[PDB]
Design a binder for this molecule. Sequence first.
Ligand SMILES: *[C@@H](C)[C@H]1/C(=C/c2[nH]c(/C=C3N=C(/C=C4\NC(=O)C(CC)=C4C)C(C)=C\3CCC(=O)O)c(CCC(=O)O)c2C)NC(=O)[C@@H]1C
Ligand SMILES: *[C@H](C)[C@H]1/C(=C/c2[nH]c(/C=C3N=C(/C=C4\NC(=O)C(CC)=C4C)C(C)=C\3CCC(=O)O)c(CCC(=O)O)c2C)NC(=O)[C@@H]1C
Ligand SMILES: *[C@H](C)[C@H]1/C(=C/c2[nH]c(/C=C3N=C(/C=C4\NC(=O)C(CC)=C4C)C(C)=C\3CCC(=O)O)c(CCC(=O)O)c2C)NC(=O)[C@@H]1C
Ligand SMILES: *[C@H](C)[C@H]1/C(=C/c2[nH]c(/C=C3N=C(/C=C4\NC(=O)C(CC)=C4C)C(C)=C\3CCC(=O)O)c(CCC(=O)O)c2C)NC(=O)[C@@H]1C
Ligand SMILES: *[C@H](C)[C@H]1/C(=C/c2[nH]c(/C=C3N=C(/C=C4\NC(=O)C(CC)=C4C)C(C)=C\3CCC(=O)O)c(CCC(=O)O)c2C)NC(=O)[C@@H]1C
Ligand SMILES: *[C@H](C)[C@H]1/C(=C/c2[nH]c(/C=C3N=C(/C=C4\NC(=O)C(CC)=C4C)C(C)=C\3CCC(=O)O)c(CCC(=O)O)c2C)NC(=O)[C@@H]1C
Ligand SMILES: *[C@H](C)[C@H]1/C(=C/c2[nH]c(/C=C3N=C(/C=C4\NC(=O)C(CC)=C4C)C(C)=C\3CCC(=O)O)c(CCC(=O)O)c2C)NC(=O)[C@@H]1C
Lengths: 169, 67, 169, 161, 161, 161, 49, 160, 160, 160, 160, 160
Amino acid sequence: MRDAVTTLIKNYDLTGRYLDRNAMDELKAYFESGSARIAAAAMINANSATIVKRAAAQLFEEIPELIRPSGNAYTTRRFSACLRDMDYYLRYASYALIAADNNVLDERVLQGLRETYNSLGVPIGPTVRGIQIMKEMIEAMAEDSSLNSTDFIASPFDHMTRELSELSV
Amino acid sequence: MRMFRITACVPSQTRIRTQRELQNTYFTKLVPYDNWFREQQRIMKMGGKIVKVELATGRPGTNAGLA
Amino acid sequence: PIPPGFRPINIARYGPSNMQKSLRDMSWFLRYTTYAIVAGDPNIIVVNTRGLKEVIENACSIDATIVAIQEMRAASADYFRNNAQAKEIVLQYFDILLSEFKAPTPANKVRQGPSNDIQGLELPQSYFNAAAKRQKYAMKPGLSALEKNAVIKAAYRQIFERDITKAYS
Amino acid sequence: MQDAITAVINSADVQGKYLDGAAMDKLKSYFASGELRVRAASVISANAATIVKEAVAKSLLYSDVTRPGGNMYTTRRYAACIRDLDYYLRYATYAMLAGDASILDERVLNGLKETYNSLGVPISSTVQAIQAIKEVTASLVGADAGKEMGVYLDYICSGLS
Amino acid sequence: MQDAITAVINSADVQGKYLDGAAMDKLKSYFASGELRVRAASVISANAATIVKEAVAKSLLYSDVTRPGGNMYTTRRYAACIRDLDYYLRYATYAMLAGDASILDERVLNGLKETYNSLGVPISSTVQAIQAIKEVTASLVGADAGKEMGVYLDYICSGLS
Amino acid sequence: MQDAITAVINSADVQGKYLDGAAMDKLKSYFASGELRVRAASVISANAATIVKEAVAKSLLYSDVTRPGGNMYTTRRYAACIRDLDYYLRYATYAMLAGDASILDERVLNGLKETYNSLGVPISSTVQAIQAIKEVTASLVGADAGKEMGVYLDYICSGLS
Amino acid sequence: SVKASGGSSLARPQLYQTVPVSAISQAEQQDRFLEGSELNELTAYFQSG
Amino acid sequence: SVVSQVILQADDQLRYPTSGELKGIQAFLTTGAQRIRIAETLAENEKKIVDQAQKQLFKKHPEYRAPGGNAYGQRQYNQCLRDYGWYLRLVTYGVLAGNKEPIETTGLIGVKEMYNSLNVPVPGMVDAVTVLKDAALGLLSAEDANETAPYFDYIIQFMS
Amino acid sequence: SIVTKSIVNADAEARYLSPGELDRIKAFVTGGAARLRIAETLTGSRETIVKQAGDRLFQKRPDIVSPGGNAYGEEMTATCLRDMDYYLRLVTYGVVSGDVTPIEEIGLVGVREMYRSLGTPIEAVAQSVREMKEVASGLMSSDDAAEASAYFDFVIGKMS
Amino acid sequence: SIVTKSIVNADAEARYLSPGELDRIKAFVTGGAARLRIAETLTGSRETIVKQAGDRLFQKRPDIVSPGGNAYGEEMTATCLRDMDYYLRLVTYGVVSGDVTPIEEIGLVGVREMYRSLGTPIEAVAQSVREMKEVASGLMSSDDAAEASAYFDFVIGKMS
Amino acid sequence: SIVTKSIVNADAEARYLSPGELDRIKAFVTGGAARLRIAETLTGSRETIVKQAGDRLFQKRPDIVSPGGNAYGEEMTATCLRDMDYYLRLVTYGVVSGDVTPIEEIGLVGVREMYRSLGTPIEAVAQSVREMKEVASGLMSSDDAAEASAYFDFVIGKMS
Amino acid sequence: SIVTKSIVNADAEARYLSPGELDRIKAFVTGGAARLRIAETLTGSRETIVKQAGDRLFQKRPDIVSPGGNAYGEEMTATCLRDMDYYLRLVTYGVVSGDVTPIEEIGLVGVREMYRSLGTPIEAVAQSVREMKEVASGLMSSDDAAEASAYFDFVIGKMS
Ligand SMILES: *[C@@H](C)[C@H]1/C(=C/c2[nH]c(/C=C3N=C(/C=C4\NC(=O)C(CC)=C4C)C(C)=C\3CCC(=O)O)c(CCC(=O)O)c2C)NC(=O)[C@@H]1C
Ligand SMILES: *[C@H](C)[C@H]1/C(=C/c2[nH]c(/C=C3N=C(/C=C4\NC(=O)C(CC)=C4C)C(C)=C\3CCC(=O)O)c(CCC(=O)O)c2C)NC(=O)[C@@H]1C
Ligand SMILES: *[C@H](C)[C@H]1/C(=C/c2[nH]c(/C=C3N=C(/C=C4\NC(=O)C(CC)=C4C)C(C)=C\3CCC(=O)O)c(CCC(=O)O)c2C)NC(=O)[C@@H]1C
Ligand SMILES: *[C@H](C)[C@H]1/C(=C/c2[nH]c(/C=C3N=C(/C=C4\NC(=O)C(CC)=C4C)C(C)=C\3CCC(=O)O)c(CCC(=O)O)c2C)NC(=O)[C@@H]1C
Ligand SMILES: *[C@H](C)[C@H]1/C(=C/c2[nH]c(/C=C3N=C(/C=C4\NC(=O)C(CC)=C4C)C(C)=C\3CCC(=O)O)c(CCC(=O)O)c2C)NC(=O)[C@@H]1C
Ligand SMILES: *[C@H](C)[C@H]1/C(=C/c2[nH]c(/C=C3N=C(/C=C4\NC(=O)C(CC)=C4C)C(C)=C\3CCC(=O)O)c(CCC(=O)O)c2C)NC(=O)[C@@H]1C
Ligand SMILES: *[C@H](C)[C@H]1/C(=C/c2[nH]c(/C=C3N=C(/C=C4\NC(=O)C(CC)=C4C)C(C)=C\3CCC(=O)O)c(CCC(=O)O)c2C)NC(=O)[C@@H]1C
C-alpha cells in the first residue's frame, strides 16, 4: 500500500534519481496539506454513521426500485449488507484522504469490485451514485465547517467512481 | 524425533468480536522439538499459559541420534 | 393483547410516504410469515427481522409495530382456528417473529486482518444466519466411535478435498 | 456420548443379552416422556435469549462480581459469561433431548473447571448462575420438564464444582 | 531414533573422543549380525499377519476379554487390538533392524502405560500376547534371530509392566 | 502485556476510581524518565549483536558447558543458546522501554524454567550469562540506565531461579 | 480502470433455509446418502406440507 | 498505550522498534503533561458534565422515563449515571494512555451484545455518549477539547 | 440413534434444533412403539432364525463344513452360530434404536480385518445375514418386515 | 511511511483511524519540515559524503581493495562507490518517509544473499554505511544527526 | 544413520521395510567393513592430516595469523586446530555411519550463526576443511578417497 | 524406484541429494544385473507359472469354481487367470525396478474397494499370488527365489 510519499519515492527509485526540488515541492505541499487532511478525516470520524445513514436515505429515494421487490436492497439483510458496503467505502475514503493517494483504494477496494458485484448481481450505477452522494455530503459538511482546504475531499470518491464505473464513452 | 509433552490453556482474544464456536482452551499436546519454539512463541503472544511441559520424548542431552 | 406503551399514529401527521411504507411493511410481514409457513423453517423471519428494530425505530413507532404484529397474530389465529395441530405452528411462528423483531441488533462479525498485509473486514449478523453454515468438527478426547470416525473422515476431506480412505483405503 | 436407547443397548450388551422387560418398559417411559421433552426443547429454543436474560438479571447483576475487582466487571468478561450461559442452556437442551447426561462430560465438562481455575473464574458464582438458569427454566416450562432439566443442570454444577 | 552405530557415536561424542576398539567391537558385532537381522526382518514381514493370527489364536481367543463385557469384545475393539499387536511386531522389527530399542521405548512407550491405564486394557494379557508373538517368531525364524527378537519383545513387556 | 502507564490505569480499574495523586506522581516520573528509556532502547537496538557476542565471549566461552560433555557443546546447542540470549535482550529492551516487567512475566516467564528443566539446561550458567548481559548493557549505556536494565534482569534472575 | 481481472464466477448465497435444503445440505457436507434421520425430517415435512 | 502498540508491533514483526515509532513515543512522552492536565480537570469536574449530559439525553429521548422503557426505577437511573461516570472514567484513561486501548479493553469490546442482553438501545446510548461529548467539549478549553474529541468519536464509531 | 445424530449434527452446526428436526423426533418417538414391537417379535423368534440360517447355509455353501474350511466338528459351528446370534442381536439393537449407529458402535465396522485375521469369509457372513433377512421376512409380516429389512440390507451391504 | 503504517494498523482491525494514529500522523506532519531539511542537506552533500566515507572505508579496511580483495581495481572501486551512493539515496528516502520501510523494501531484503552471491564482505559494507553515518552526522546539527543516524543504524543492524 | 533414515521412511509410510531397501541395508552392511577400514586409517592419521591441513591453511591465508584476523595468538590457533580436529572427527563419524546425518546433527547446521557470533570467516573455514579433504585424499587410497570425498564435499557445500 | 523416492524426498525437503542417498542410488545402479536376470527368467516363464498356480488354486479351493461362486463361468475363470497374469506382470515390474512403488501405484491402491465391489475374495487373490510365489520359487534358483518372493510376500501382505 502506497501513500503520496511512498509513490513519489517509488517513482524516483524507478529512475534511480535523488529527490530534486520538484520532489521537495511535492512533499512540502503534502506536508502543509496534511493538517487539513487530518482535520477532514477527524471530521468524518465523528459523523460517519450519520453520513452512511443519510446516504442510504438519499440513494433509495433517487433510485426507489432498490427497496422495491426484485431490487438488490430489498430485504433488511441486503439493506444491512449495502450499508456495510457504504461504511467500507467511507472508511477507505477516509484512508485515502489521510494518505493523499488512491493506491489504497485500488489495492483494497477496486481490484475485485466488479467481479464481486457481477457475481452477486449487485448494481454498480447505484453504488457509484451512493459514492457521489457521500462525496456531496462530505463536501457540504466541510464547506459548513471551518475547513480552509476542501479541494482534496472529492478526489478519492471521484477516483472510485472512475475506476469502478463502466466506461460509457 | 524428539518431542515435548506440553499442557496449556490459551484463551481466544477475538472470539467475542468474531462470534465463533467455542473450543476447550486447555489441552495436553505432543509437539515436536523443531516446531516447539514457534509453538511456544505463538502461545505466549496469544496470551495463553503453558502450565506443564516435559521432555517426554528422547533423552535429555543427546548429542547424536536426534530425529 | 399486550400493549406496553403505544400511542396511535395520526395519518396526516405521519405523512403519506411513511404511511405507504408502513402498509407495505405490514403486507410484507404477512407475506414472509406465509413464506416461512410454507418453508417450514423460521430462518427467513429470523434473518429479515433480527436487525430491523434499529433501522425501523428512527421514523416509525416500535410499540406500534409490536401492537401491529400482535393484532396480526390474533387475527390470523381467530380467522384460521382449524385445530390445535395446525394453529400452534402459526402461533409459534408469530411468536418467533415478535421475539426476533423485539430483539435488538447483534454485533456484526468482524474478520480481523491476520497481519499488516491483509485487510480486516466486517459482516452483519444476518448474513451468517441463512448462508448454509459449515459443520464444525472438534475432536474431544472422550468422543464415541461414530463421531470420532466422522471427525477423522471430515479431516481427510478437508486435507485431500475428498474421502480418500473410503475411495482408495 | 449416548442416549437412553443407546444406554440400554450398552447395558444389555455388556452381558451380551437381548432386550429384557426392564429395558422394554423404561424405553416405554422414554417414549412416553419424549413428546414433553421435544415441547420443552421447542419452547426454550424459541425463548432461549430471554431465559439467559432473566437468569443474569436475578443472578449476577447488582453484585460485587459486577463491581470492579470482580470477574463480571469488564464488558468482554460479561459477554464471555453470558455466551457461556447460553452455551450451557444449549448443551442442557441437548442433554434433555438426548435423555442421557453423557453429553456434558463429553463436550463441556472435559476441562471447564480447571480452565476456569486457570482464568480465575468464580466457580461459586457460576454455580449460582446454574441455579438461576434452573429456576427460570422451571418457571418457564413447568415443574415436570423443569425437574428433569434440573437433573442435567445439577450434573453441570456438580461437574464444575 | 538411535540405532547401534549412532548410539556408539553418541557415546564417543559425549566424551569427545574418536571411535576406538571399545565401541568398534560392538560395531563389528552389528555388521556381523546385520544380514541375520535383515533376513529375519524379511521373514517376519513375509509372515507378519500369520504371526498375529496364530498369536491371538494361542493366547487371546476364547478368553474373558473376547467374551461380552471383556476388553476385546466389539469389532472395532478387536481391530484396534490386532492393530496394536502388529504395531508392536513392526516396531520390534524396526528395533531389531536398528540394533537398539530407542524406537521401541520412545515411539511406542511414550505414554502407552498411561493410556492403557486410562482405557482399562489388561497389561498382563497384552504381555501374554507379546510372549505369544515371541514364541511364534522364535519357532518361525530360528534360535539366534528368535532370541534377538525376544530381547526387544520382553523389553516391550518390561515397558508395559 | 501492560505498560507502566497502563499499570496505574489497571489498578484504578480494579479500584473502580479515577487517578489519585499517589499514582499521578508515578505517572509524571515515568513521563520524566521515558525519553532516556526509549533512547537507551534505541542504542541497544543499534548495538544488539554486540551484547550477545560479548556476553558469550566473557561468560560462556571456554567452559565445561561448551567443551565436549556440555549442554552447549554442539553447534545446534550454540545456535539455540545465542538465539535465546538474543530473545532475552530483545524482551529486556521491550521492558525497559515499556516501564513494566509484565512482558517478561507473560511472554518469557510462562514456562521457560520448566522447559529448561525438561531440556537439562544449566540454570546457573543462564544466570551468570544474564549477569554478563547486565555488565555489557551497563558498560554500553551507563549506570543510570544500567541499574534500570538490571532491575528487569534481576526479575529474570528471580523468575528463572 | 483496473488492469487485471481475477475472474467472476457465479455466486449463489443461500437467502434462507428450508427443511429439504437443511437435510440435503447436512447429508452433502457430511458426504453421506440420506440416512434415517434425514429421511425422517423429509417424511415429516412432506406429510405436513 | 502507544508504548504497548509499538512493543506489540515489534514483537509481531520479530524485531526491535524502529525510528518513526521511537519518535512517536518521544512525541507522546512530550504531550503527556497535556494529557495529565486534561485527565485531572475532567476528573475534578465530572459531575456537572454527567448532570447536563443526562439532562440533554432524557430531554432528547423521553421514552426511558416514560412507560415501556428501561429507566423507571431510581436504581436503573443510578445505574445509567454510573454508566455515564464509567464512560467518562474510561475517556480519561484513554486520554492518559494516548490511544484507544483502555477504552477498548475495558468498555467497548462486546458492549453491543452486552446491552443486547440488558435491552438498553445502542443508538440511544450513542446519543448519550454524544451529549456527554458535547458537555465535555463545552467544559474543556479549545485545544484540550480538540485533543479529547476523537476518543468520544471512536466510542461513537465502535458502538454504532 | 436418531436423537444421537440429532445432537451431533446440531452441535456441529452450532445452533438449537430446527422445527423440522423436532418433527423428526416426534415421528421417531411415535414410531418407537412399532420398532419395539418388531424388536420383541424378533427376540421371540430369535432361535429359529439362528437354526434355519445355519442349516440353510450349510446346505447352500458346504465348503466351510467340509475339510479346508473354518467349520470343523461341533465347537467351530457353535462359535459360528454364536456369531449369528450376535449379529441378530445387533439387528434387533438397530431396529429398537431406529438407526444403525449402535450396530456400528458394537459391530458393523472393523469386521473385515476381524474376519481377515480369523480367516472367515466376509461374503459368506453377508450371505448368512441374507438368509436371516428372508427367514425373518417369511415368519413376520412383510409390510411390517420392510422396517427390519431396511436394517438387514444395510448390514449385508456393509459386510458385502 | 508512518501514514501507511497507521492506515494499515487501523484497517487490519477494520475500524477508522484511532486518535493515537491521528496524533502520530500529526507528529509526522509537524516533523515533515525538519525531515525535509535533513533529506535536502543529504542530497545536496551526496557526493562529498560518498567520497569522504569511501576514503575512510578504504583507509580502515585495505584488504577489500588490495589485490585478491572483492573491490580491487578501479571498476570495482567505482562499483563500491555506486553501492554506497545507492544506500545513501535509500537513506534519503527513509528520511523523507519518516521510517525505515523504503530502505527495507528496496535494499535490505535479500541483501545478505545478494552480497554472498557477489562475494562481498557484508561487514565491510556495514562499515561503509557506518562511515557514511559518521560523515553525514558531522554535516548537520545534533538532533538532525541523531535523526539521520537512526536510519543509518537501521541499515547497520540489517547488514550485521 | 542410513539404517535409522530407512526406518524413518518406513514408519513415515507406515509399513514394513521394502525389499529394495532391505537389500540396500545389506549392501551398507557389506560395505561397512570398508568404511571401518577407512575409519582405522583416518584415526591412525588423525594428527598428521590436521597438522598438515592447518599448515596449508595458514600458508594459503596469512591474514588469519596476521593482525585483523580472528585467530591471532597461540591459544587462538590452538582453538582453530581444535575446530579442525572436531570437523575431521565428524567426517570420520559420517564415514562410519554411512550418511551426513551425524555431521548435520552435531556440527553442520547452525554453523552460520556459530561463526557469525564468533566473527569467523565461513569461507575461510570452508577453505580449511577443503585443505583437510585434499590432504586426506592425498593420504588415502583411490577408492577410499573417493568414498570420503563425497562426505567432505558435503561439508564444503553446507559450510561454504 | 529408489531414485524416484530419493529425488521426491529431497525435493520435498527443498535440498540436493546428499551422498548418503547418492551411494544408495549408485549401489542400486551397480547391483542391477541380478534383478534384470530374474526379470527375464520370470518373463520367460510368464505363462507356465500362471497355468500351474491357477491349477493349484482351483484344486485347493473349489469354492471359487463352485456354483454361485465369484468365478463360476469359463470367461470368469479366463479373467481370473488374466488377473494372475496382471499381478505376475506387476511382480516383474517391481523386480526390474528394485522397488515396490510400481506395484503400489498400479495394482495396490483401491484393490480392496475394487474387489469389495466385484465380490472377488481378497484372501483368495492373496492365495493366488502366494501360489505364483511358490511356483516361481520352485522354478528358479534359491537366492533369486528369495529375491522374487520378497516382492511376492509384499503383494500378499498388502492383500492381507
Ligand atoms: C460359520 C457359518 C462362519 C464362520 C465363523 C467362525 N467364527 C469364528 C471365530 C470368531 N469369530 C469372532 C467374531 C466376533 N466376536 C464378537 O464378540 C463379535 C461381535 C459381536 C464378532 C464379530 C471371534 C472373536 C472369533 C474367535 C472365537 C472367540 O469368540 O473367542 C470361528 C472359529 C475359527 C477358529 O479358528 O477358532 C468360525 C468357524 N466361519 C466361516 O467360514 C463361516 C462364514
Ligand atoms: C411504522 C409503524 C411502520 C413502518 C414504516 C417504515 N418503514 C420504512 C422502511 C423500511 N421498512 C423495512 C422493513 C422490512 N425489511 C424486511 O426484510 C421485512 C420483512 C421481514 C420488512 C417488513 C426496511 C428494511 C426499510 C428500509 C428500506 C426503506 O427505506 O424503505 C420506513 C423508513 C425508515 C427511514 O426513513 O429511516 C418507515 C418510516 N415499518 C413498520 O414495520 C411499521 C409497519
Ligand atoms: C459466567 C457464568 C461467569 C464467568 C465466565 C467467564 N468465562 C470466561 C472465559 C472463557 N470461558 C470459556 C468457556 C468454554 N470453553 C469450552 O470449551 C466451553 C464449552 C463449548 C465453554 C462454555 C472460554 C473458551 C473462555 C475464554 C474466552 C473465549 O471466548 O475464548 C471469562 C473471561 C475471563 C477473562 O478475563 O477473559 C469469564 C468472565 N466468570 C464470571 O465471573 C461469571 C460469573
Ligand atoms: C490388544 C493387544 C488388547 C487391547 C487393547 C486396546 N487397544 C485399543 C485402542 C488403542 N490402541 C492404542 C495403541 C497405539 N496407538 C498408536 O498410535 C501406538 C504407537 C504405534 C500404539 C501403541 C491406542 C492409543 C488406543 C486408543 C484409541 C485408539 O483406537 O487409538 C482399545 C480400545 C479402547 C476404546 O475402546 O476406546 C483396546 C481395548 N485390549 C485387549 O483386551 C487386548 C489384550
Ligand atoms: C544459552 C544462554 C544457554 C542454554 C540454551 C539453550 N536453549 C536451548 C533450546 C531451547 N530453549 C527454548 C526456550 C525458549 N522458548 C521461547 O519461546 C523463548 C524465548 C522467550 C525461549 C528462550 C526452547 C523452546 C528450546 C528448544 C529449541 C526449539 O524448540 O527449536 C538449547 C538446546 C538444547 C538441545 O539442543 O537439546 C540450549 C543449549 N543452554 C546452555 O547451556 C546455555 C548456557
Ligand atoms: C444510561 C446511559 C443508559 C442505561 C443504563 C443502564 N445500565 C444498566 C446496567 C448495567 N450497566 C453496566 C455498565 C458497564 N459495564 C462495563 O464494563 C462498563 C464500562 C466500564 C459499563 C459502562 C452494567 C455492567 C450493568 C449491569 C449491572 C447492574 O444492572 O447493576 C441498567 C439496568 C438494566 C436493568 O434493566 O436492570 C440500565 C437501565 N439505560 C438507559 O436508558 C440509558 C440510555
Ligand atoms: C579455524 C579453522 C578458524 C577459526 C577458529 C576459531 N575457533 C574459535 C573458537 C571456537 N570455535 C567454536 C566452534 C565449535 N565448537 C564445537 O564444539 C563445534 C562443533 C564440533 C564447533 C563448530 C567454538 C564454540 C569456539 C569458542 C570456544 C569455546 O568452546 O568456548 C576461535 C576463537 C573466537 C574468539 O573470538 O576468541 C577462533 C579464532 N578462526 C580462523 O580464522 C580460522 C579460519
